[PDB]
Design brief:
Structural class of chain G: alpha/beta
Organism of A, E, F: Homo sapiens
Oligomer: part of a larger assembly
Order of helices and strands of chain A: HHHH
PDB class: hydrolase
Number of strands of chain A: 0
Helix content of chain A: 40-55%
Largest sheet of chain G: 5 strands, parallel
Structural class of chain A: mainly alpha
Strand order of the largest sheet of chain G: 2-3-4-1-5
Number of helices of chain G: 13
Distance between the termini of chain A: 38 Å
Shape of chain G: globular
Entry title: Co-chaperone Bag1-bound human 26S proteasome in SBAG1 state
Keywords: Protein degradation, protease, AAA+ ATPase, Hsp70, cochaperone, Bag1, Complex
Number of helices of chain A: 4
Bound molecules: adenosine-5'-diphosphate
Helix content of chain G: 25-40%
Chains A, E, F: Isoform 2 of 26S proteasome regulatory subunit 8
Radius of gyration of chain A: 16 Å
Order of helices and strands of chain G: HHEHEHHEHHEHEHHHHH
Chains: A mainly alpha (about 100), B alpha+beta (about 250), C alpha+beta (about 160), D alpha/beta (about 400), G alpha/beta (about 280), H alpha+beta (about 230), I mainly alpha (about 50)
Distance between the termini of chain G: 72 Å
Largest interface: B-H, 23 and 32 residues
Number of strands of chain G: 5
Strand content of chain G: 5-15%
């Protein structure tokens, strides 16, 4: 009781969900005219909306050091590199 | 006091060690086998695709284990290697003894017997690996089998064993049709379900490894579909997707 | 736990049993020095003799492993004697299997392999005695080596 | 510090149809008319006063002596004329109180007033409203009745006899001179146990009820789990003699573990204290302890003995008729359908308990309300079975 | 328009505390009281 | 009005003025929060869940 | 009357601004990261206007859960001078005292001092062992500490990015810290400042021994190659203490003996890498 | 128990600790070039007392199979001794196949007594193997529990992460001639703290002609002009 | 890329030309970047003297 009402679970965001979260978080910010945000999200393996937020803030910070209102695709991919630094470190790959 | 392993029951009566290993088999690895008339095929997901490899082993998941069958592991590679070696040894020992290729069911029963022994007696870890087998024999023709670390194998005809195995098998159930199934449409179904279970759309032919077993004139041919053929399959699937999406 | 109780890898990624076993050598209260030279190799250890009722004739820590190899032990004397006996057995067995005398580096390598087997497995324990063995080797001059409770055999000049 | 609470609520739960009809409407009209008439009567009695007598003799003598400034402090001790009270910041006053002095409501450990200046007690705050250290009588005498659960007639009769040996016909075993607080040890499948609570509400129709579920493996150095429940059934003897429902804890908190020593103390403390309270030779009281569980095996030998803890009762799974009755009860509030699809959902069913019945009844309504909203959704006929599958019975790899 | 009462559950006695937010602290009849990850493990 | 602040007197402590809320501003944030906006438009990718 | 000054009400440090004690690049710890710290100084380094327009949300709370390695305060004594900004030691150990009722008031006063000077950074020390440990039960005045931390949370929430002042706590272990400060939305950037990092340790030794011009004219035959490759922790504080342990004024220069004695004093014997290598 | 053991629910905790130990600190980069393979490693002896011509990090297991390793040198010896015995047994059974690269994959596979039979305590060394008796080179890695990885370029040191990053950024590439050993030395330089010299750095090369541990003369020659 | 000696030399030359053009603050920034880059090379005896 108090939990038998529902056991709704959170699926980790798919690539298109991550695209949607990118749109939500980047509507507020300013960036360049052209960007393939769908591919940008798909480049991120799995991850989550927290990671989408991290990518958005990393793109903002990277555009800060250049001091321009138009976040370029190169800065965006540098932000995608925030999905990195986790990887699997050593190639355990034992499965 | 000395450390003793856990090959025991539960107060309820469950072998929770074996159950944990079987569930961990779902974690990591992704393979699926689809059985069809005149050809049965395996699809595997290339987990690590770092650009610094060379792909000289020619096969990581799919293993040729006999003239008339081929398996695919989804477990810890350490156990997978020894299990494949034992499987080939068993098949070849049968070939020596009976001068006849070993039936797939007998081969799978031998392997699952060895895994059952490993989970049964002694202070030995269960073999944390679950593998598929596709094969052809004289008695039952094309056969597909799935063995879990519990040693309780099952004779399947369309199954998956990987991480999103639930999603893959749901897709297979939705778009699987027996009898009508043929080799080419089986390939289309396999690539479609792999695209579904691998989040990144437009799967590169490098991230997917697939091998088809076919019956030529009195001889079993197990061909691992190479990069060009795989990506041509991908292109045909892409044409089908675009057509179906646009026609609405 | 038992990471620090048995010879198993630490979660931090270290081996604490051999790390302890090295300090066993410091335990026992003794020091030893070995100097390789232009042509000779001389070693020396202090001879801590408490009370003269002992026999200073037989309290030594240096031994002949073979006709040309001399060893100095450091650490617990029981393990030291065991490893000296093992080294002598290895030298004799080598001279039996292969005609020429055992090179000092090869002997130290075999002793180190024995110690490495000891730090492997869990039934036995490493021997707390570090051995410095020296000898003249042709085409090599004097040679000095040190085998340790871990299995790392090196050490020179 | 707590004796009783004012029960002037729960206006006549017996609304016969419990569904919108003329009879129920007329009953509600009579209820609201009674409320109106009672409010009017009390207001006219208080306004059309019997007599005007000065300042009701309040402001003349006691109110002024009580004075305007006051402070609240606990009352500690009592003496023949003075009273010894522990006011705020650890102050202590031994003063006799003669204005607004209600000795019965005063009591040690209660909040009283201090008139400042010449600090003496001038009144008491009987409300106080802070007896919150250990609260287990908050749910006392639950309103649930026999009719709430059906199809358990044998068990109902057995428990009713076991707890109506007191109250009813006490002179029976008073003349027999035994006065047995044996309690009842209840078995039952894990799929039930709140059904054990339901069969306890039958007794709860008389006197109060206390609950200790799970408690703890009393690691506490003082122990005092069972000892405090002993104090609390002493409190229940002060109140109407209440029952103590220790379902599950009688099983874990009192587990028949073969281990003897070096084991959580409870085995030392808890079982021994349980037996000490369950033996009538130590503690009196019409208190009847209901030790319910779902693991009969872990019955401790001390708990096993009918000698001290008699009246063992087994709760079985519902039969076909019991399933029919319980489903009727649970769907009666919701007007399942007009086709009355009753027996199809249970004829082939096996090992279905009260919790599952309630769950499936709730989920049928949930699924209808989801999108199939059709009042008596015609879909209910088969959707009751649809959410009766609902998976979720059990899942554990394959192993088979 | 209920609340945003957010408690992690990893606070350490577990008794009391929650009583105020359960009834009195609410500050609103509508109350969602969102608890974070349930740090209390199975059987605790 | 209950659950507000008041001013009292020196010795008799009689009421002076029913002051606005002081308890709420001081301990507004202990472990709770009032209603934020965070509207569902910002929530994305989980429509099949919401 | 209302007293204008707020810092000296309870002392607890004051305006460490307008004073170069350790500038910035003169630090021996090089970076550790220091990029997240330049990120933290971006808000003092104006850039509040560039936080908008671009659409970024600049960080507000920077916790450094490191041991005394890197100093953990050479970043706040610096930065505050790299971009001129007020610097306050706060000191958590002093704060927990009889002035727990005045604790809320002093938090308000120091927050007001910071708001008065948008170039200001709060630096709080010694949180872990005394200020709001979460695993050991409340012992007496621990409720007072929790109420003080609650008022600190209230003040940091009332800040709500009103100005460009910054707040940084420095802790040895963040595990005992309360989730209220630890949760995002109050403090986000967690930085760990590890041990001397033998390469970085040698760099620190060079930097310190250069601070005092070549250790006040140290002799050539003293090089740190031997006493630095110790693998013996020897935090930057210990490195500075060893450098100042050239106080042997029997001679006007420094020899390797002084460094050997400095390393010998206050040290623990940890060795034996050859087995691992 | 007496094997590669300690595997909890979905984990290999002992193996993971072994890899934490194999993090080590000897960089030991490896590069698979078109003409052959280079295995370079750092020999940073404590003090000048130790010797460099005494012990080696690169071992020729056979005619054209060379081997370099990672942490736990005492375990690495035993492992290389076992590997030599295994390659020799294979060559003795399948007589005279001059087996190095058609044997490099096979010896990497027979590196299952490596770890699948751990020996109560698993080995704590990850080793790179190079072979060129197939007309093509081969660089494989065997880790304290896994198997042949078939790398093209990698590192196994304390800074193996940024070492591998450096390898890919400097484009290990495919057209690189045999003298990618310069790039290997550069990759070491990154994970090296000192003026590296001939005795400080040990490198072996395995080209189609065979395998050879470069002497300090050639190592110093390559280190010059860097 | 991840060259280090070339980066240190380039940054040092940039600092030198800022000093030659009397660009003191940019020279200081470039020199600080030069130090941050030059931490990598442990014993470049000529280069360390150039930086100092
Ligand atoms: N036979 C029944 N008739 C009416 N109501 C029942 C019956 N059995 C159970 N219930 C109701 O369902 C609830 C769950 O009972 P139970 O199955 O014992 O729960 P649990 O399995 O959690 O102990 C009880 O509170 C009770 O009110
Ligand atoms: N250039 C430098 N780099 C790193 N640390 C230094 C440097 N110069 C001095 N220090 C030391 O850093 C120390 C700061 O330590 P402290 O503030 O006590 O640590 P924490 O901030 O963890 O409490 C000072 O005692 C000082 O000796």
């Amino acid at each position: 009781p108090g939990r038998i009402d529902r056991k709704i679970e959170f699926p980790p965001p798919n690539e298109e969900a991550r695209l949607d979260i990118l749109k939500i978080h980047s509507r507020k910010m300013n960036l360049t005219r052209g960007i393939n945000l769908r591919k940008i999200a798909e480049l991120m393996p799995g991850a989550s909306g927290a990671e989408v937020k991290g990518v958005c803030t990393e793109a903002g910070m990277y555009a800060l050091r250049e001091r321009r209102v138009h976040v370029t695709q190169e800065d965006f991919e540098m932000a995608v590199a925030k999905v990195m630094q986790k990887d699997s470190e050593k190639n355990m790959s034992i499965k | 006091r000395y450390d003793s392993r856990t090959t025991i029951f539960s107060p309820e009566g469950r072998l929770y060690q074996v159950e944990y290993a079987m569930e961990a088999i779902g974690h990591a690895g992704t393979c699926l086998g689809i059985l069809a008339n005149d050809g049965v095929l395996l699809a595997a997901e290339r987990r690590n695709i770092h650009k610094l490899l060379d792909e000289v082993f020619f096969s990581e998941k799919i293993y040729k284990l006999n003239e008339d069958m081929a398996c695919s592991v989804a477990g810890i590679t350490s156990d997978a290697n020894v299990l494949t070696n034992e499987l080939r040894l068993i098949a070849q020992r049968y070939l020596l003894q009976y001068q006849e290729p070993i039936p797939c069911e007998q081969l799978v029963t031998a392997l699952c017997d060895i895994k059952q022994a490993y989970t049964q007696f002694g202070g030995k870890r269960p073999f944390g690996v679950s593998l598929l087998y596709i094969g052809w024999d004289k008695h039952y023709g094309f056969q597909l089998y799935q063995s879990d670390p519990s040693g309780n194998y099952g004779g399947w005809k369309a199954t998956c064993i990987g991480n999103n195995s639930a999603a893959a098998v749901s897709m297979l159930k939705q778009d699987y049709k027996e009898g009508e199934m043929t080799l080419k449409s089986a390939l289309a179904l396999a690539i479609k379900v792999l695209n579904k279970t691998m989040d990144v759309s437009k799967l590169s032919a490098e991230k997917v490894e697939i091998a088809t077993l076919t019956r030529e004139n009195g001889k079993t041919v197990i061909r691992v579909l190479k990069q060009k053929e795989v990506e041509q399959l991908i292109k045909k699937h892409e044409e089908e997707e675009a057509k179906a999406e646009r026609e609405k | 736990g038992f990471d620090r109780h048995i010879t198993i890898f630490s979660p931090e990624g270290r081996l604490y049993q051999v790390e302890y076993a090295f300090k066993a050598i410091n335990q026992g209260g003794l020091t030893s020095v070995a100097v390789r030279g232009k042509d000779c190799a001389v070693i020396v250890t202090q001879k801590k003799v408490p009370d003269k009722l002992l026999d200073s004739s037989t309290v030594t820590h240096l031994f002949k492993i073979t006709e040309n190899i001399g060893c100095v032990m450091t650490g617990m004397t029981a393990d030291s004697r065991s490893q000296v006996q093992r080294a002598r057995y290895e030298a004799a067995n080598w001279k039996y299997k292969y005609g020429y005398e055992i090179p000092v580096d090869m002997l130290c390598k075999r002793i180190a392999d024995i110690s490495q087997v000891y730090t492997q497995n869990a039934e036995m324990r490493p021997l707390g005695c570090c051995m410095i063995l020296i000898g003249i080797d042709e085409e090599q001059g004097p040679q000095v080596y040190k085998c340790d409770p871990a299995g790392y055999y090196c050490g020179f000049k | 510090k707590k004796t009783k609470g004012p029960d002037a609520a729960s206006k006549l739960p017996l609304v016969t149809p419990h569904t919108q009809c003329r009879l129920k409407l007329l009953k509600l009209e009579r209820i609201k008319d009674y409320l109106l008439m009672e409010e009017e009567f009390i207001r006219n009695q208080e306004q059309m006063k019997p007599l005007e007598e000065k300042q009701e003799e309040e402001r003349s003598k006691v109110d002024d002596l009580r004075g305007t400034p006051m402070s609240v402090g606990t009352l500690e001790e009592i003496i023949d004329d003075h009273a010894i009270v522990s006011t705020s910041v650890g102050s202590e006053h031994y003063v006799s109180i003669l204005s607004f002095v209600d000795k019965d409501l005063l009591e040690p450990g209660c909040s009283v007033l201090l008139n400042h200046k010449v600090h003496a007690v001038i009144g008491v705050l009987m409300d106080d409203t802070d007896p919150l250290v250990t609260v287990m009588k908050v749910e006392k005498a639950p309103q649930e009745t026999y009719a709430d659960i059906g199809g358990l007639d044998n068990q109902i009769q057995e428990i009713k006899e076991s707890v109506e040996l007191p109250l009813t016909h006490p002179e029976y075993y008073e003349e027999m001179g035994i006065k047995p607080p044996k309690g009842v040890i209840l078995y039952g499948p894990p799929g039930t146990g709140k059904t054990l609570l339901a069969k306890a509400v039958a007794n709860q129709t008389s006197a109060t009820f206390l609950r200790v579920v799970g408690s703890e493996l009393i690691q506490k150095y003082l122990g005092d789990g069972p000892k405090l429940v002993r104090e609390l059934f002493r409190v229940a003897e002060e109140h109407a003699p209440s029952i103590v429902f220790i379902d599950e804890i009688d099983a874990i908190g009192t587990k028949r573990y073969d281990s003897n020593s070096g084991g959580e103390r409870e085995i030392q403390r808890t079982m021994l204290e349980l037996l000490n309270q369950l033996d009538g030779f130590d503690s009196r009281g019409d208190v009847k302890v209901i030790m319910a569980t779902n693991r009969i095996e872990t019955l401790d030998p001390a708990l096993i003995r009918p000698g001290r803890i008699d009246r063992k009762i087994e709760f079985p799974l519902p039969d076909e008729k019991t399933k029919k009755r319980i489903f009727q009860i649970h769907t009666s509030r919701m007007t399942l359908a007009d086709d009355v699809t009753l027996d199809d959902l249970i004829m082939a069913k096996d090992d279905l308990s009260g919790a599952d019945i309630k769950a499936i009844c709730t989920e049928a309504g949930l699924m209808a309300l989801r999108e199939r909203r059709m009042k008596v959704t015609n879909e209910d006929f088969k959707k009751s079975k649809e959410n009766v599958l609902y998976k979720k019975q059990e899942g554990t790899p394959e192993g088979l | 328009d209920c609340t945003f009462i957010r408690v992690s559950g990893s606070e350490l006695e577990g008794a009391r505390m929650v009583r105020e937010l359960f009834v009195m602290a609410r500050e609103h009849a509508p109350s969602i009281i969102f608890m974070d990850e349930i740090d209390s493990i199975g059987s605790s | 009005t209950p659950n507000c602040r008041v001013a009292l007197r020196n010795d008799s402590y009689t009421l002076h003025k029913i002051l606005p809320n002081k308890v709420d501003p001081l301990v507004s944030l202990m472990m709770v929060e009032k209603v934020p906006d965070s509207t569902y438009e910002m929530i994305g990718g989980l429509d099949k869940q919401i | 009357d209302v007293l204008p000054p707020e810092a000296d009400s309870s002392i607890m440090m004051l305006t460490s601004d307008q004073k170069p004690d350790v500038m910035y690049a003169d630090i021996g710890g090089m970076d550790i990261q220091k990029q997240e710290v330049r990120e933290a100084v971006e808000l003092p380094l104006t850039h509040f206007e560039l936080y908008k327009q671009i659409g970024i949300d600049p960080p507000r709370g920077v916790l450094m859960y490191g041991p005394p390695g890197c100093g953990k305060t050479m970043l706040a004594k610096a930065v505050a001078h790299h971009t001129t900004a007020a610097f306050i030691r706060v000191v958590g150990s002093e704060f927990v005292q009889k002035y727990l009722g005045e604790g809320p008031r002093m938090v308000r006063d120091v927050f007001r001092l910071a708001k008065e000077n948008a170039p200001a950074i709060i630096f709080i020390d010694e949180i872990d062992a005394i200020a709001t440990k979460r695993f050991d039960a409340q012992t007496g005045a621990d409720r007072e500490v929790q109420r003080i931390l609650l008022e600190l949370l209230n003040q940091m929430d009332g800040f709500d990015q009103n100005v460009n002042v910054k707040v940084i706590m420095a802790t040895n272990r963040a595990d005992t810290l309360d989730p209220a400060l630890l949760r995002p939305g109050r403090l986000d950037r967690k930085i760990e400042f590890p041990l001397p990092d033998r390469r970085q340790k040698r760099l620190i030794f060079s930097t310190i021994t250069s601070k005092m011009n070549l250790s006040e004219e140290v002799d050539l035959e003293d090089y740190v190659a031997r006493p630095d490759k110790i693998s013996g922790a020897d935090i930057n504080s210990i490195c500075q203490e060893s450098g100042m342990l050239a106080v042997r004024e029997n001679r006007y220069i420094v020899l390797a003996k002084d460094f050997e004695k400095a390393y010998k004093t206050v040290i623990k014997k940890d060795e034996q890498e050859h087995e691992f290598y | 128990f007496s094997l590669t053991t300690f595997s909890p629910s979905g984990k290999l905790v002992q193996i993971e600790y072994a890899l934490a130990a194999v993090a080590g600190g000897a960089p030991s980069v490896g590069i698979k070039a078109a003409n052959g393979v280079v295995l370079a490693t750092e020999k940073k002896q404590k003090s000048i007392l130790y010797d460099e011509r005494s012990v080696h990090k690169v071992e020729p297991i056979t005619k054209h199979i060379g081997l370099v390793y990672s942490g736990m040198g005492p375990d690495y010896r035993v492992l290389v001794h076992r590997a030599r015995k295994l390659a020799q047994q294979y060559y003795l059974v399948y007589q005279e196949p001059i087996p190095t690269a058609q044997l490099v994959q096979r010896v990497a596979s027979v590196m299952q007594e490596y770890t699948q039979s751990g020996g109560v305590r698993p080995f704590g060394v990850s080793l790179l193997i190079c072979g060129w008796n197939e007309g093509r080179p081969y660089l494989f890695q065997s880790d304290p529990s896994g198997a042949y990885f078939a790398w093209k370029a990698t590192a196994m040191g304390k800074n193996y992460v940024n070492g591998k990053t450096f390898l890919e950024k400097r484009y290990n590439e495919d057209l690189e001639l045999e003298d990618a050993i310069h790039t290997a030395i550069l990759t070491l330089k990154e994970s090296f703290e000192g003026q590296m010299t001939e005795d400080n750095i040990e490198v072996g090369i395995c080209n189609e002609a065979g395998f050879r541990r470069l002497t300090p003369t050639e190592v110093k020659d390559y280190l010059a002009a860097i | 890329m991840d060259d280090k000696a070339l980066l240190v030399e380039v940054q040092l030359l940039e600092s030198k030309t800022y000093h030659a053009l009397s660009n003191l603050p940019k020279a200081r920034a470039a020199l600080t970047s030069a130090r941050t880059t030059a931490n990598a090379i442990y014993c470049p005896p000529k280069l360390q003297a150039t930086l100092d």
